[PDB]
A = this chain, B = another copy of it.
Amino acid sequence: ELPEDPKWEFPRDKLTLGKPLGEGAFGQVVMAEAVGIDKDKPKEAVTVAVKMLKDDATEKDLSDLVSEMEMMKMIGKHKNIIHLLGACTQDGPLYVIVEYASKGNLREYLRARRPEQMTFKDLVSCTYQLARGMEYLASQKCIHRDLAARNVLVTENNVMKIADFGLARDINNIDYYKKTTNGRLPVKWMAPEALFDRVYTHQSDVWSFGVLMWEIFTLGGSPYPGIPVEELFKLLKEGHRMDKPANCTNELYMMMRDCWHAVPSQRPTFKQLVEDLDRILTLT
């Protein structure tokens, strides 16, 4: 059923599943103890996160979990991306072992720290880290397609980790102009071209990053508040764009607006966002 990949395979007998961390779209995540997952420490038990199918899993759920694992293999390691640690794929259920982020997704993290409150600098830092994570991802020819605060995890060290690669794809593994393309992307975080033209590029992720930025500076606010999903794209075409967040600087808001530029090629690249953000952070 599943091809061997020795380099990533982890022995089932050295993994001990713990309490669940939450049920998701196509899978379940549980806390776990993995012995020797760090090959330099063969006897150390490391706390990890394990993603597996739910009891009511579908064939497509498995296909998605497999695909998510493969994406994480090809992406590599980076400070601001949740990292793949190994997997149990031979004779037995599929387990995707990834690093554990003790503080949950960014949205929850931020909503809980609404007046250890968050400082302006903290917010710019979170943003900078995520921009840096996306710059790396883009250079790996990978489009995330599901960028959002709920899909960012925060470690014990408050390090931002881009996660949830269930919809991620290689830039060339997209079926352009097909009526079903991008059909499973959350609408309020989606670039307009993703639906109107049925394409997806790094510039599409940049639009999503803009929405992420708005979530960050609203401390976990809900995008397009009061506007139903059904009438969003009509408003987007007409030029509607979310208003500027209070904890936000005019400059940072202009950056969000640039990310929400109608023309894909007129939006900044992740390379540029990192540069401007590094500058702003350094000033702050």
Q: Which of A57, A222, A230 has the most CB of B within 10 A?
A: A230
Whether A229 and B53, one on each chain, are in contact in the complex, defined by CB atoms closer than 8 angstroms, is: yes
What chain B residues lie within 8 Å of A60 (beta carbons)? 183-184
What chain B residues lie within 8 Å of A148 (beta carbons)? 56
Whether A230 and B62, one on each chain, are in contact in the complex, defined by CB atoms closer than 8 angstroms, is: yes
Q: Which of A84-102 contact B (CB under 8 A)?
A: 92-94
Taking the nearest CB of chain B, how far is it from the CB of A113, in angstroms?
21
What chain B residues lie within 8 Å of A93 (beta carbons)? 228-231
What chain B residues lie within 8 Å of A229 (beta carbons)? 53, 55, 57, 62, 93
What chain B residues lie within 8 Å of A185 (beta carbons)? 58-59
In the complex, A93 Cα to B229 Cα: how many Å?
7
Whether B184 and A56, one on each chain, are in contact in the complex, defined by CB atoms closer than 8 angstroms, is: no
What chain B residues lie within 8 Å of A231 (beta carbons)? 92-93
In the complex, A92 Cα to B53 Cα: how many Å?
36
Q: Which of A75-121 contact B (CB under 8 A)?
A: 92-94
- List residues of chain A with CB under 8 Å of any chain B CB: 1, 53, 55-60, 62-63, 92-94, 148, 150, 182-189, 195, 222-223, 228-231
Can you report 22 residue pairs joining A to B where beta carbons are below 8 Å apart? A1-B230, A53-B228, A53-B230, A55-B188, A55-B229, A56-B150, A56-B186, A56-B187, A56-B188, A57-B186, A57-B187, A57-B229, A58-B184, A58-B187, A59-B183, A59-B187, A60-B184, A63-B183, A93-B228, A93-B229, A93-B230, A94-B230
